[PDB]
């Protein structure tokens, strides 16, 4: 029922700074579900599936795009991690666990779990080591899984029976971050440099965005990284997040309706007290976030640690209608101003 | 009951 323009606005409401990624997932999910409604009633039969492969920095909202999508789409969603995954029978894990995880959302799905979505994290960790149960071997097992098959699944765990569930219909989104991939593509496309005199040094570590280089990424470069070309062939769609920005972090706390700044504002509305967050206080949070190399994920630690004293003393305090936060308070050398 | 899981 939805359209790419309608879903783009909803995605924009919760995600920002990633414009190309919205159009990729919009048209992909749009055409993916179109195939489910129409099925194979048309002349064309066995409509092939189009998988999605995301590559971007850490904490760049890759998981948020899949989580926010499940809320509007309403289909079941799961967040699997490939770090634990092992090669067909070892101590760490087996691929079978992933299949049950999706069913676990509703625990009863015959013609409903086929339309679900799955997310994978840390895909680069299984890169083929060339010096294996961690490397290439793991990829070979996922080939048949993504291509579509049926796995026996005890519904609810229990009957003397097992249920069959198709997986061709089920779309997969392999999310992950490929660190060091800039050097591989730089020598191939832009320039061989970084070590020589005339060669450009990596001066623009944070001055310029590496993202632009990632836009020119191709599957051939992924082969040198360690992945199998056969594995990448199953995921023709490609999404590339560029970077995270300091001004974006200020917008992340103001433009999204679910911003953390707005949660505290609503907390005190019922209490009958006003809340404020000046622009001079948000810019400081951006510096501390980049300092810990964590992105937006390491944001609540800075906010909750600063407002621990104010929140603890707010019920005790009386005749206080407004709260003002300053940049000095974020550093910890000052106490927030209170207005009666 | 009892799981005998070992890997070489």
């Amino acid at each position: 029922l939805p359209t790419p323009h309608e879903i783009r606005n909803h995605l924009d409401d919760y995600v920002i700074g990633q414009e190309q990624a919205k159009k990729v997932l919009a048209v992909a999910v749009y055409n993916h579900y179109k195939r489910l409604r129409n099925g194979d009633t048309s002349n064309g039969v066995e409509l092939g599936k189009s998988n999605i492969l995301l590559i971007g920095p850490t904490g760049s909202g890759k998981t948020l795009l899949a989580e926010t999508l499940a809320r509007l789409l309403d289909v079941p969603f799961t967040m699997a991690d490939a770090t634990t995954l092992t090669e067909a029978g070892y101590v760490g894990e087996d691929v079978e666990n992933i299949i049950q995880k999706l069913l676990q959302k509703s625990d009863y799905d015959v013609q409903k779990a086929q339309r679900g979505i799955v997310y994978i994290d840390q895909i680069d960790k299984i890169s083929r080591k060339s010096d294996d149960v961690s490397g290439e071997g793991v990829q070979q097992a996922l080939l048949k899984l993504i291509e579509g098959t049926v796995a026996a699944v005890p519904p609810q765990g229990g009957q003397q029976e097992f249920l069959q569930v198709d997986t061709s219909k089920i779309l997969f989104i392999c999310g992950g971050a490929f660190a060091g991939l800039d050097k591989v593509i730089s020598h191939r496309v832009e320039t061989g440099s970084g070590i020589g005199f005339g060669a450009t040094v990596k001066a623009k570590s944070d001055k310029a965005s590496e993202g632009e280089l990632l836009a020119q990424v191709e599957p051939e470069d992924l082969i040198k990284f360690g992945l199998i070309p056969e594995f990448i062939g199953r995921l023709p769609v490609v999404a590339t997040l560029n970077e995270l920005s300091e001004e974006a972090l200020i917008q992340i706390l103001k433009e999204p309706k679910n911003a953390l700044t707005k949660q505290y504002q609503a907390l005190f509305n019922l209490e009958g007290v006003d809340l404020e967050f000046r622009d001079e206080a948000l810019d400081a949070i951006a510096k501390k976030a980049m300092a810990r190399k964590t992105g937006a994920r390491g944001l609540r630690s800075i906010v909750e640690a600063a407002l621990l004293d104010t929140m603890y003393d707010l019920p005790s305090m009386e005749d206080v209608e407004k709260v003002v936060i300053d940049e000095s308070v974020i550093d910890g050398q000052s106490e927030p101003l209170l207005i009666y | 009951x009892x799981x005998x899981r070992x890997x070489x």
Binding site: D124, K129, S130, V184, G194, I195, A199, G226 | -
Partner: protein, 192 residues
Amino acid sequence: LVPMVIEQTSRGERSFDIYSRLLKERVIFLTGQVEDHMANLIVAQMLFLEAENPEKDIYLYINSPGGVITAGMSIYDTMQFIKPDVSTICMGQAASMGAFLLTAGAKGKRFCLPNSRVMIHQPLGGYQGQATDIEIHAREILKVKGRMNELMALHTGQSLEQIERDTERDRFLSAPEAVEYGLVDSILTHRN
């Protein structure tokens, strides 16, 4: 002794010598006197980079007091034959033959350090034997001197008459003077 370094790659860790690591980035080092063995080693490096990629610029750092002429001309002809632009940089000193390979680099990609020094003079030689043989070796070295001046004028842009007068004796040229002389294009004072 040569220090060993580790190049972090996705496939795994690999150990390289300091000279081999820079070779991977299309960088060659010209150190010491120019001889038949040292010259033949640099030629193999250029050819190896040509096959890997013929469209990426090569960087040649030169720090040498010069040497044999025939050993140096093999490098010059190679740089002109191959398609990639061989960028040249002068570190420390550039003698007669070191200066000829410096100016022979691709136009616009020649640099000299702020404190580098270039020296140019005429070919040196000698012979012992009959008078008939001395005349033969004298005519040969005269052709080389004339040939080396013709090419020097071609890349430096000066006239052949000027190169003949300036190369009669040793002539030192500072880094600023080399730019004005057409020998180089600019100076790499700081990294911008």
